């Protein structure tokens, strides 16, 4: 469950750009 620092997937951000 989201808590603390969330993890953003930069490989996904790149793939979807």
């Amino acid at each position: 469950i989201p808590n603390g620092y969330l993890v953003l997937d930069l490989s996904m951000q790149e793939a979807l750009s």
Partner: antibody
Amino acid sequence: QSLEESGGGLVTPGGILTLTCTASGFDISRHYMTWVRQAPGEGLEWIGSIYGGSTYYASWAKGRFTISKTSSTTVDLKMTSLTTEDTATYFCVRGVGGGLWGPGTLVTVSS
Amino acid sequence: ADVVMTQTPSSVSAAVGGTVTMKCQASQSISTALVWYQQKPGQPPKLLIRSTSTLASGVPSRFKGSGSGTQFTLTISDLECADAATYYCQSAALIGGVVFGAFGGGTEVVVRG
């Protein structure tokens, strides 16, 4: 889209060098433009990334390597106090964990 | 300290048609924000898998990525001579304003023809 690194060559130990990554076909501002190097016979190593105005460095590279945007299509990598440990092919990558790579540029630190 | 990706084994071998696996262990949890690269001489590293398990374009299904958190695996089945290469994992996460971008040390795959 394409990427091409430039600026590699022979540099004397103790010297400085600036590499450039030039993009074609896309806006670098929209991506984590990333520098990676590979010493001959060794593994890939993340140096740092730039996303718009934000820069990120590997702890080993902080202070000695600096990344900046130098035009609408270029980012650079400024390297200082070079030694033979910095001899490597340097690549730029569109994205952290991205799929678009330049062919690399070779830096040779030698007297 | 930056995240460290420990990749094992350093080298693995199988016959044509066989299956090999390699592992990437992260020193800090990175959810599924992890990629796998294939590198051969002549061209830069090639993205194989992103977001742990999503095949990149053109990559055949015999490559399979699994795992999460701190443990990740790449499996190559039905090995072909074209799969001889060195494979690297890379963390690819933004966590707390820090880019977790470290590479694993690589696994050389030898294909026995």
